[PDB]
């Protein structure tokens, strides 16, 4: 798995590959790892597919009930609910989740929740087995307040390399853009990103 | 795998005199080959003219002392401020220790004071609460270095009267508080030389009818 | 165990504590850890004490024969090469961790060597259980172009840090100074900051205190004439 | 414990049980009675793990005696054996199972028939003309297979039992210190005091 | 299981004024079972004395080995071996079995016949030499012996005072060890007379 | 290949003479004179540096050799044979003594070891 | 450790050694291995020191409650069974206990029960328990009679512990003697093994293997 | 029972004449990966206490929330919450020490080593340690992890016993702490150049310094070092 | 195998050795002689691992008989015991050690003295007035410590030995099927055929 | 450890960090991991320090004896000798070696020999624990026939990132330049490369 989320001038974009493996067998080559827990709060999942789906479903339930009572939750609030589940059940979970969301007050925000269940607010985050190979590239190429097009290029190029070197990553590059304008899904195919 | 136990080193020594008792211990606290503290008190005044030390794993040691001190407080509340006698304190500590029989306090406990006739008393416990009144007891790291010396110099073991050649034993004459303190200091000086976990400082608590007094002495810091 | 090595202007100095232990018990309070490989090549050992002694004497013996064969004074790099190849062959089972220093016709040298056979070069080095305490002092006070007096001071200060802070180290500081164009000076018990205080009591017994069953003379002499 | 034997003859059931109690290195006792009277015409012998054997036997004894008082009636050997089997079958899936094997020798006063039941610690029940637990059967069953007749007298049953014990005393490595022999018939339970 | 504590036993050596003392208990056991109360652990080759604790089969084997070697030494050198030289021979001999060692704790004691200097030394099972000025201890009650020696010992004791010191060090150390005791022997060694004394002690 | 000479090249003649030893002694007789004198507080050994050519640096050829710090050797006869014997004598002082006893061998015993090596060249194959 | 108890004409003799060890290290030579449950009942310590101490004091409390409720001395049978039923509840948890519950009542006479931490409860005439039990059995079995006098029985128990103290490395220190009568137990002193060994050797002529 | 995942390295501290100093780097390691470079591991409680935490970061964040909740709770129905009934360093430590020992007793520890540094109401210096086992101890200098092995020896040269504390100024103490942090950066493979430092003084109060860097580093001598023995070029 | 005992009296050495050979479940033999005559006045009993015991004993026997023929002389019991010890001390560091414990009972014709040596599989030798291997000593040494005298007759030694065997038969769990007893004195070696 | 070798127009350059660790303790912060087996044939070492030193010493011996008989060896020949030792003793070695050399006929060449003892000729190579983090960066930024200055910048920037993320890497960046002109050593200190 190769996943990342990047804040930019107009908000935040989440990116992910589409490969799901059982050992060396690709059980699903068109997986959607970008999951919606609220209208403009999404997450990237890595680790146990069963665990991260179970967690995401519970979070979506919590934020739906939150919204009915208190109105739209913040991205920080969503990250907290994720953290509570991951931290308290750390013995029985294998889950690495990146939370990304867009407020109008706070704009684009990214939170990463690694194995232990800690929370870290960052300008951008990378995770999954494929992320190891792009720590160098992402650190050198990330800038704050990039344009939408620049951020799409940054994520496309980054996950391209992660896919190239990690056998557990591959397929299509999926992206979800979160701005004031709304929610936009993007997809990029192998013939496009392999020639970069 | 998580190991709930540790070893903080340290060595303690209790000796019962005719009308007094001493409980001594070094002030060094360690893990593995490092020193945590050169002065971390290990022998405590628990009230009612009783002194206590729980040597071994310091977390368990602190917990037990804390619970016993608490037991003394509640004994006063429940029984009209009656003084907790040393024998009663000893039986109470057995139950505190045996209460965790299947997840023990990893310590060797010694208490000292005076019995109800005013004579010096020392009680010694294993980790799970078996106990005995004793005249002399070393505990902890250098206990094996100290006890044989005390058998010889306090109880005059293997010592006979010159001229009789083994026929007449050296008589067991009583020792003063000044005499006992000399043997304690020499016991710890000797232990410091040959045991790496013993050193830094020696703190002695002396118990008489007048109350509890403290004495401190430097030990080698290497 | 704390052992250090420090380079200076015209040579190199090594130092060591004097405590040897078996578990938590101190076996010898005044142990000699500075080993002579050749007159002007000395090394200090940590780890298994028999191994550090044996490997020093073996290489020291072979170094002497080599010196006689070649009609040349031994070199530190030769001792280093012979030590590492021997230790590598035994794949770490010979538990010798050494700091090798000396002067030779090539100049002054300072190396470390580990039990598996890897070697390092440096201006200041430390080994043993008290190496972290020692290295803290070395990293705080070392500079380029140290004098002989400054290097001896730094080395012994580094050993002291081990003596006081590491339970595996204690007692005295031994030093050996190897200067170019001079005899190596071995300073046994250079510092003595751990003398035991007088005891409170004398434990000398009265004669006849111990019970005896039998007495006899032991014949240590050979079979006699006549 | 070790050897427990049982043989059902014409008009009685005979149970033989070893007298030794060994705790590792030493033989602590040589006169131990490994049996309990459950009711006037029903006897149970037992062998297995220390402590559990007697605990189980006395527990069963108490339950049958309770039934006897409540109903003023003695349960049939078959009924008692079924109760015992269920207790052991329950026990085997417990937190800590009873490690006990039993023989139940009883005389059914309704049918006028002796009955022998063999039950192991799993709750495995079988009615037999003769039975054993542990290694006892390995030495004795070939002799019993040869000599046994369903119309044997009590005296003939005891003689065949003596031959079984003699073979055990010859070929078994352990010294089980002889056996206590008890007979269960229409008149109740009695012990053969010379064997 | 641990080879050095199957049989049990202890040895202690001390230096005095123009004299050395070496002493040992007499027990040989099989763990809890006491087997022999006459198993002496001190041997001598000329004027050099050697105590050996640990596994009893190795104790016997090494004694026979050092008798073997010192006898050849003497025939070739035309003189008795000295304590300093013998110490090196023990160390060499132990280290040759580096990866299959004798499970022993040897102790050397003696007086150099030429210099008159008292000498003691101790070894680990693999040959490391402990050359102490004051005292050497070895065996299953070595902790106890360290405790006794460290407090009881003082330098320059006269032969008959050293006897009392070393005897009381051994006896009280052994009485705190299950696998030591069952009798004891003390050697008092001077430049040209050696006295051997069997001690009376508790037999449990 | 292999050394197929596993038999003695020195043998007794009918008269009881060991020819090769006698002939070796003859080679020694032709050799340059060397001597030794023992005093109460020391020993001296000496010989002539018979230089084969004046262009040769005779300081580089050592006829008198240190065996141990307290033992020295000189010879008469075949120089190359001496040189290898010195190498063997230096090594045997370590292997058969110093590595065992932690001290250098006494003179008589080192001599005994050198003698043994020379005896074996008189009987071996 | 070596503990024994045997029934005879005059009641029960209980004899124990005094040594406690942790590995090879002798922790104590002055251990009290006879637990005075009450003035009529005695128990012996073997296995876990704490387990024996704690639960046999507890037993004394249960026995006291029994006689308060029933206005009658508790039987040895009932007292021993309270302890064996208790340790059976804890079976598997790791209790370590090997004890003889000894008493003398009107209805039973002198009675000894061996109680053990895996649930065993055995009535008997002679029991020995501990690391030195085999040595003590030898002396007991060859010299025991029902018609021993109180004096000779006391000596037999003393001599049997001495035998074990000598040979067994983990037994020794001193010998504690008790004599249990119907009117209660009677303490017969502490006897140092060191002094007792030499005394017995001379007077009896035994231990010729040992030089004295 | 668990294992630490994201971890923080050494916390170091010492007493001086008028108060205490404590320091810790800003790194959150993920095994050998130096994952997070902006982690604050010194957490102030009021104006008299700073709690320094090493070990598992997820547990650190949990402890941080406990301390935040402690301040809220103390203010409830407490008119003297900012005066006589404010939280003391000794109160904060005893609470944490209780929690740590309870958690280890349930076989579910908070995988940390903690140093509570502060100044009491009467001006007394407070410095005490607690870890995942519930083990506690006090000393003129305290350090966790690698700091225990490398910082303590250096800090003990300044304050070797209790009587050295009044002789030690804040300048000398801070200097020693800063040097120790440099030594740790040289020698600890899980350390970072960036660190935070806090001073709690009985006169000048709490001074919290962020974004400090290790400086005056010696590396020039590396240019002369060649090979591992015999190599000359 | 199991129990081997030895006792040195005034003028002879008496060795007692069990007759049972057990292979796990069954007692295969009850008349096994666990001893070998090394020389006319030297006897060795043995116990340990199956196969190795007899292999070792016969190997020793062959070596001593070889020495006897070569020199036309019987080695002293001390000399034989030293040879045996060295073989076992050599064996313990071998690829596969001899797992054999022995007793050597011999009468020294030069000194006119009986001698008993106890050697275990490690090569641990001790000269004793009485000895044993395995668990035998645990049961018998207390009796021997009490009754033994150095001036005992052979008949008194046999009586003390009977008491030792009786205690073994009472308290040992295993049935060792009695003992074969052999006496070693100035006239040589003979077997007591009724014991 | 972070090591790499890069071919360029005028030859080849080897690069390495200087950190040697025992667990989390830095046993040597100024290690020289660039080792000389022949005049213009060098190697970068990773894995067991004992093993890679032992191997390098044996190779230096082999190439010295080769030179005495047959003249200057090729870089391919040196790589082969390394491979022979690594492959035949694979059970008892933990060694990852990059071999770099300059011929006049073949110019700059790079060979990498991973754990198994296989050989791979490459335009450039990266190895060591720190290399994982710069697979993305190096792949994106490497060009063939770079100038000396460009290659120095490439290696400096690459190892900078490897050091930044890998705790097992650090200290100074050492480099050795191999061209027709000769052998040049370069060193770059933390204050220089950390601000890149
Ligand atoms: C420096 C301390 C260390 O570097 N390491 C601590 C381990 C100590 C080793 C050494 N002690 C010994 O060698 C003692 N003998 C010994 O340990 N033998 C081993 C055994 O388990 O018995 C065998 C060989 C595996 C000896 C002193 C009795 C030691 O003290 N090292 C010092 C320094 C090098 C003297
Ligand atoms: Mg799961
Ligand atoms: Mg892929
Ligand atoms: Mg120290
Ligand atoms: Mg003893
Ligand atoms: Mg005993």
Distance CA(A183)–CA(A160), nearest Å, equals: 23
Which CATH number fits the domain that encloses residue H155? 3.60.20.10
Q: Structurally, how many domains does chain I consist of? A: 1
* Contact assessment for residue C120 and residue C90, using Cβ atoms and an 8 Å cutoff: no
* J112 in A contact zone (CB under 8 Å): no
Structure tokens at J79: 């790589």
Distance CA(E137)–CA(J193), nearest Å, equals: 59
Q: Both ends of chain G: CA-CA distance in Å?
A: 25
Distance CA(I132)–CA(I3), nearest Å, equals: 8
| 3-state SS class at C203 | coil
Ligand 1 atom 34: residue of nearest CA: C46
Distance CA(F91)–CA(F72), nearest Å, equals: 14
Q: How far is the CA of A163 from the centre of ligand 3 (A)?
A: 4
Ligand 1 atom 7: residue of nearest CA: C47
* H66 in B contact zone (CB under 8 Å): no
* B151 in E contact zone (CB under 8 Å): yes
Using an 8 Å CB-CB cutoff, list chain B residues near C206.
162
Residue among G166, D23, G142 at smallest CA distance from I165: G142
Handedness of CA C102, C108, C114, C115 (dihedral sign): negative
* G193 in E contact zone (CB under 8 Å): yes
Spatial neighbors of E57 by CB under 8 A, at least 6 apart, are: I88, I89, I92, I122, I123, I124
Phi first, then psi: give them for residue G27, nearest 5 degrees: -75, -40
C209: distance to nearest CA of chain F, Å?
Answer: 41
Q: Structurally, how many domains does chain C consist of? A: 1
Q: How far is the CA of E95 from the centre of ligand 1 (A)?
A: 14
Q: Which of H1, H72, H136, H169 is catalytic?
A: H1
Distances from the Cα of H190 to the Cαs of D130, G14, J135, in angstroms?
75, 66, 22
* H179 in C contact zone (CB under 8 Å): yes
| 3-state SS class at A90 | coil
* Contact assessment for residue J1 and residue J168, using Cβ atoms and an 8 Å cutoff: yes
Distance CA(A74)–CA(A84), nearest Å, equals: 16
* Contact assessment for residue I180 and residue I35, using Cβ atoms and an 8 Å cutoff: yes
Element (H, E) at H56: strand H49-56
Q: Which of I20, I138, I173 sits opposite D22 (nearest CB)?
A: I173
| 3-state SS class at C102 | strand
Whether C contacts B, i.e. 3 or more CB pairs less than 8 A apart, is yes
CA angle B193/B14/G48 to nearest 5° reads 100
Residue among I19, I17, I11 at smallest CA distance from I157: I11
* Contact assessment for residue A96 and residue A128, using Cβ atoms and an 8 Å cutoff: yes
Structure tokens at G129: 């328990």
Rg of chain A, C-alpha, whole Å:
16
Q: Structurally, how many domains does chain H consist of? A: 1
Across the interface, whether the CB atoms of C64 and F66 are under 8 A apart is answered: no
| 3-state SS class at G203 | helix
Distance CA(I84)–CA(I125), nearest Å, equals: 9
Handedness of CA D153, D156, D158, D160 (dihedral sign): negative
Neighbours of G18 (CB within 10 A): 25
Range of the domain at D155: 1-195
Which long-range contacts link C137-145 to residues 24+ away (Cβ below 8 Å)? C137/C161, C137/H153, C137/H154, C138/C4, C138/C6, C139/H182, C139/H183, C139/H186, C139/H187, C139/H218, C140/H154, C140/H179, C140/H183, C142/C6, C142/H218, C143/H218, C144/H220, C144/H221, C145/C9
CATH number for the segment(s) E1-204: 3.60.20.10
Which CATH number fits the domain that encloses residue G46? 3.60.20.10
CA-based nearest residue in chain J for residue H35: J165
Neighbours of E90 (CB within 10 A): 24
Residue to test with chain A: of J136, J193, J195, most A Cβ within 10 A: J136
If you count them, how many residues does chain D have? 195
* J140 in A contact zone (CB under 8 Å): yes
Across the interface, whether the CB atoms of I85 and E100 are under 8 A apart is answered: no
Question: Hey, which chains touch F, using 3+ CB pairs under 8 Å?
Answer: C, E
Which CATH number fits the domain that encloses residue I2? 3.60.20.10
Distances from the Cα of B41 to the Cαs of B145, B189, B201, B204, H161, in angstroms?
22, 18, 10, 10, 15
Q: Where are the alpha helices (DSSP H) in chain D?
A: 52-71, 77-91, 136-147, 154-171
* J131 in H contact zone (CB under 8 Å): no
Across the interface, whether the CB atoms of F101 and E77 are under 8 A apart is answered: no
Element (H, E) at H95: helix H89-105
Distance CA(E4)–CA(E9), nearest Å, equals: 10
Q: Which of C2, C22, C55 to mutate to test ligand 1, by most ligand atoms within 8 A of the CB atom?
A: C22
* Contact assessment for residue H156 and residue H141, using Cβ atoms and an 8 Å cutoff: yes
Across the interface, whether the CB atoms of B157 and E148 are under 8 A apart is answered: no
Range of the domain at H172: 1-233
Structure tokens at A80: 């907290």
CA angle I131/I137/I142 to nearest 5° reads 100
Using an 8 Å CB-CB cutoff, list chain G residues near C213.
211-212
Residue among D44, D48, D43 at smallest CA distance from D21: D48
* Contact assessment for residue I108 and residue I78, using Cβ atoms and an 8 Å cutoff: yes
Using an 8 Å CB-CB cutoff, list chain C residues near J50.
88, 92, 114, 116-118
Range of the domain at C219: 1-226
* Contact assessment for residue H47 and residue H114, using Cβ atoms and an 8 Å cutoff: no
Structure tokens at H51: 């709690």
Ligand having the closest approach to the CA of A190 = 3
Ligand 1 site, CB within 6 A = C 1, 20-22, 27, 31, 33, 45-50, 52, 128-129, 168; E 124, 126, 128
Number of B:E CB contacts under 8 A?
58
Distance CA(J132)–CA(J126), nearest Å, equals: 9
Q: What domains are there in chain B, each with its CATH number?
A: 1-222 (3.60.20.10)
CATH topology of domain A1-196: 3.60.20
Please give the order of strands across the beta sheet that includes E184-190: C212-217, E193-199, E184-190, E19-25, E10-16, E135-139
> Phi/psi zone of residue A71: left (φ > 0), alpha (ψ -120 to 50 degrees), beta?
left
Which CATH number fits the domain that encloses residue C154? 3.60.20.10
Phi first, then psi: give them for residue F68, nearest 5 degrees: -130, 170
Q: What is the resolution of this structure in A?
A: 2.7
Whether C1 sits among the annotated catalytic residues: the reply is: yes
| Residue I97 CB-density burial (10 A; 0-12 exposed, 13-18 middle, 19+ buried) | middle
Question: Hey, which chains touch E, using 3+ CB pairs under 8 Å?
Answer: B, C, F, G, I
- Percentages helix, strand, coil for chain D, rounded to the nearest 5? 35, 35, 35
CA I168 to chain centre: 17
C56: distance to nearest CA of chain F, Å?
Answer: 12
Distances from the Cα of F109 to the Cαs of E188, F35, G88, H5, in angstroms?
34, 21, 77, 68
Across the interface, whether the CB atoms of C25 and B194 are under 8 A apart is answered: yes
């Amino acid at each position: 798995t190769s996943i990342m989320a990047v804040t930019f001038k107009d908000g935040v974009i989440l990116g992910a590959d589409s490969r799901t493996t059982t050992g060396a067998y690709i059980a699903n080559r068109v997986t959607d790892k970008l999951t919606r827990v609220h209208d403009k709060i999404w997450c990237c999942r890595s680790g146990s597919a069963a665990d991260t789906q179970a967690i995401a479903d519970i979070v979506q339930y919590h934020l739906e009930l939150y919204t009915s009572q208190y109105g739209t939750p913040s991205t920080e609030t969503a990250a907290s609910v994720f953290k509570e589940l991951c931290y308290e059940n750390k013995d029985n979970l294998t889950a690495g989740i990146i939370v990304a969301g867009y407020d109008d007050k706070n704009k684009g925000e990214v939170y990463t929740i690694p194995l232990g269940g800690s929370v870290h607010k960052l300008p951008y985050a990378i995770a999954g087995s494929g992320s190891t190979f792009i720590y160098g590239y992402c650190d050198k190429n990330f800038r704050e307040n990039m344009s939408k097009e620049e951020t799409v290029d940054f994520i496309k190029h980054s996950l391209s390399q992660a896919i190239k070197w990690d056998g557990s990553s591959g397929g299509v590059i999926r992206m979800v853009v979160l701005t004031a304008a709304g929610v936009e899904r993007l997809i990029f195919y192998p013939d496009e990103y392999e020639q970069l | 795998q998580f190991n709930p136990y540790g070893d903080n080193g340290g060595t303690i020594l209790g000796i019962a005199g005719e009308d007094f008792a001493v409980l001594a211990g070094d002030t060094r606290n360690i893990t593995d080959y490092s020193i945590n503290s050169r002065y971390e008190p290990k022998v405590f005044d628990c009230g009612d003219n009783i002194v206590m030390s729980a040597n071994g794993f310091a977390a368990d040691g602190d917990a037990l002392v804390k619970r016993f001190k608490n037991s003394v407080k509640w004994y006063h509340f429940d029984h009209n401020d009656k003084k907790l006698s040393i024998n009663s304190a000893a039986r109470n500590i057995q139950h505190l220790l045996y209460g965790k029989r299947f997840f023990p306090y990893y310590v060797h406990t010694i208490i000292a004071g005076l019995d109800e006739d005013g004579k010096g008393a020392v009680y010694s416990f294993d980790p799970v609460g078996s106990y005995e009144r004793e005249q002399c007891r070393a505990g902890g790291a250098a206990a094996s270095l100290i006890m044989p010396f005390l058998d010889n110099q306090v109880n005059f073991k293997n010592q006979y009267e010159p001229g009789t050649n083994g026929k007449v034993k050296k008589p067991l004459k009583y020792l003063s508080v000044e005499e006992v303190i000399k043997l304690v200091r020499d016991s710890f000086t000797s232990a410091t030389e040959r045991h790496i976990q013993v050193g830094d400082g020696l703190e002695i608590l002396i118990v008489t009818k007048d109350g509890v007094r403290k004495e401190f002495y430097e030990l080698k810091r290497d | 165990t704390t052992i250090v090595g420090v380079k200076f202007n015209n040579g190199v100095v090594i130092a060591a504590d004097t405590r040897s232990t078996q578990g938590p018990i101190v076996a010898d309070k005044n142990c000699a850890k500075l080993h002579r490989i050749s007159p002007k090549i000395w090394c200090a050992g940590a780890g298994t004490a028999a191994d550090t002694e044996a490997v020093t004497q073996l290489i020291g013996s072979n170094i002497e024969l080599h010196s006689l064969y070649t009609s040349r004074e031994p070199r530190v790099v030769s001792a280093l090469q012979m030590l590492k190849q021997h230790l590598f062959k035994y794949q770490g089972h010979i538990g010798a961790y050494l700091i090798v220093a000396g002067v030779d016709p090539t100049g002054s040298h300072l190396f470390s060597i580990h039990a598996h056979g890897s070697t390092d070069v440096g201006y200041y080095l430390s080994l043993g259980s008290g190496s972290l305490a020692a290295m803290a002092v070395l990293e705080s006070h070392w500079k380029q172009d140290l004098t002989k007096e400054e290097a001896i001071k730094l080395a012994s200060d580094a050993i002291q840090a081990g003596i006081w802070n590491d339970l595996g180290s204690g007692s005295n500081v031994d030093v050996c100074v190897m200067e170019i164009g001079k005899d190596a000076e071995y300073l046994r018990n250079y510092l003595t900051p751990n003398v035991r205080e007088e005891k409170q009591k004398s434990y000398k017994f009265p004669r006849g205190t111990t019970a005896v069953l039998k007495e006899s003379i032991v014949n240590i002499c050979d079979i006699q004439e006549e | 414990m070790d050897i427990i034997l049982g043989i059902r003859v014409q008009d009685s059931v005979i149970l033989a049980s070893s007298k030794a109690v060994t705790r590792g290195i030493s033989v602590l006792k040589d006169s131990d009675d490994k049996t309990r009277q459950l009711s006037p015409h029903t006897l149970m012998s037992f062998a297995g793990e220390a402590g559990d054997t007697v605990q189980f036997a006395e527990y069963i004894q108490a339950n049958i005696q309770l039934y006897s008082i409540r109903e003023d009636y003695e349960l049939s050997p078959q009924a008692v054996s079924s109760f015992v089997r269920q207790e052991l079958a329950k026990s085997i899936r417990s937190r800590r199972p009873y490690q006990v094997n039993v023989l139940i020798g009883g005389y059914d006063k309704k049918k006028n028939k002796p009955e022998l039941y063999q039950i192991d610690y799993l709750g495995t029940k079988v009615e037999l003309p003769y039975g054993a637990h542990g290694y006892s059967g390995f030495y004795t069953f070939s002799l019993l297979d040869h000599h046994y007749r369903p119309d044997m007298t009590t005296e003939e049953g005891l003689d065949l039992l003596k031959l079984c014990v003699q073979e055990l005393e010859k070929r078994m490595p352990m010294d089980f210190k002889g056996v206590i022999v008890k007979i269960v018939d229409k008149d109740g339970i009695r012990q053969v005091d010379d064997f | 299981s641990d080879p050095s504590s199957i049989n049990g036993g202890i040895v202690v050596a001390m230096t005095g004024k123009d004299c050395v003392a070496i002493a040992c208990d007499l027990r040989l056991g099989s763990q809890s079972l006491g087997v022999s109360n006459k198993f002496e652990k001190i041997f001598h080759y000329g004027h050099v004395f050697l105590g050996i604790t640990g596994l009893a089969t190795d104790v016997t084997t090494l004694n026979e080995m050092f008798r073997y070697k010192t006898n050849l030494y003497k025939l070739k050198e035309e003189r008795a071996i000295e304590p300093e030289t013998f110490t090196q021979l023990v160390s060499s001999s132990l280290y040759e079995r580096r990866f299959g060692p004798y499970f022993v704790g040897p102790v050397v004691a003696g007086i150099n016949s030429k210099s008159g200097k008292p000498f003691i030394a101790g070894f680990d099972l693999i040959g490391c030499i402990d050359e102490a000025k004051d005292f050497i201890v070895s065996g299953t009650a070595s902790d106890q012996l360290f405790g006794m020696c460290e407090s009881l010992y003082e330098p320059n004791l006269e032969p008959e005072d050293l006897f009392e010191t070393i005897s009381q060090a051994l006896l009280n150390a052994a009485d705190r060890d299950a696998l030591s005791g069952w009798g004891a022997v003390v050697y008092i060694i001077k430049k040209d007379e050696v006295v051997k004394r069997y001690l009376k002690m508790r037999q449990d | 290949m292999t050394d197929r000479y596993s038999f003695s090249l020195t043998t007794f003649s009918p008269s009881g003479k060991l020819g090769q030893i006698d002939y070796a002694l003859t080679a020694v007789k032709q050799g340059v004179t060397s001597l030794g004198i023992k005093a109460t507080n020391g020993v001296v050994i000496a010989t002539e540096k018979k230089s084969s050519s004046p262009l040769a640096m005779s300081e580089t050829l050592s006829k008198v050799s240190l065996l141990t710090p307290d033992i020295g050797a000189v010879y008469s006869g075949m120089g190359p044979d001496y040189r290898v014997l010195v190498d063997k004598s230096r090594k045997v002082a370590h292997t058969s003594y110093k590595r065992i006893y932690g001290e250098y061998p006494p003179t008589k015993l080192l001599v005994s070891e050198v003698a043994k090596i020379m005896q074996e060249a008189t009987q071996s194959g | 450790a070596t503990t024994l108890a045997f029934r005879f004409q005059g009641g029960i003799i209980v004899a124990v050694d005094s040594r406690a060890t942790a590995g090879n290290w002798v922790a104590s030579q002055t251990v009290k291995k006879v637990i005075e449950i009450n003035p009529f009942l005695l128990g012996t310590m073997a296995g876990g020191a704490a387990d024996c101490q704690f639960w046999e004091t507890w037993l004394g409390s249960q026995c006291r409650l029994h006689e308060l409720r029933e206005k009658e001395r508790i039987s040895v049978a009932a007292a021993s069974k309270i302890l064996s039923n208790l340790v059976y509840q804890y079976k598997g948890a790791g209790l370590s206990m090997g004890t003889m519950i000894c008493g003398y009542t009107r209805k039973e006479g002198p009675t000894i029960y061996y109680v053990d931490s895996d649930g065993t409860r055995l009535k008997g005439d002679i029991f020995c328990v501990g690391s030195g039990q085999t040595f003590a059995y030898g002396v007991l079995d060859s010299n025991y009679k029902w018609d021993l006098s109180v004096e000779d029985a006391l000596y037999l128990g003393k001599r049997s512990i001495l035998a074990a103290a000598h040979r067994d490395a983990y037994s020794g220190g001193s010998v504690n003697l008790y004599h249990v009568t119907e009117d209660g137990w009677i303490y017969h002193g502490n006897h140092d093994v060191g002094e007792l060994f030499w005394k017995v050797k001379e007077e009896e002529g035994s231990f010729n293997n040992v030089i004295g | 029972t668990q294992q630490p995942i994201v971890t923080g390295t050494s916390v170091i501290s010492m007493k001086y004449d008028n108060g205490v100093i404590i320091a810790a780097d800003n790194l959150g390691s993920y095994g050998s990966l130096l994952r997070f470079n902006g982690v604050e591991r010194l957490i102030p409680v009021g104006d008299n206490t700073v709690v320094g935490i090493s070990g598992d970061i997820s547990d650190m964040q949990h402890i941080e929330r406990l301390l935040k909740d402690l301040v809220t709770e103390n203010a409830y129905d407490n008119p003297l919450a900012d005066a006589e009934e404010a939280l003391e360093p000794s109160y904060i430590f005893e609470y944490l020490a209780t929690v740590m020992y309870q958690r280890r007793s349930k076989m579910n520890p908070l995988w940390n080593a903690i140093i509570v540094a502060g100044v009491q109401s009467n001006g007394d210096q407070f410095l005490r340690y607690v870890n995942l086992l519930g083990v506690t101890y006090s000393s003129p200098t305290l350090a966790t992890g690698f700091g225990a092995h490398m910082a303590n020896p250096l800090l003990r040269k300044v304050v070797d016993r209790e009587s050295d504390i009044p002789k030690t100024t804040v300048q000398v103490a801070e200097e020693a702490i800063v040097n120790a942090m440099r030594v740790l950066y040289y020698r600890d493979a899980r350390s970072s150049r960036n660190f935070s430092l806090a001073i709690i003084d009985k006169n000048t109060g709490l001074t919290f310094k962020k974004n400090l860097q290790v400086e005056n580093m010696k590396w020039d001598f590396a240019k002369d070092i060649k090979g591992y023995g015999t190599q000359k070029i």
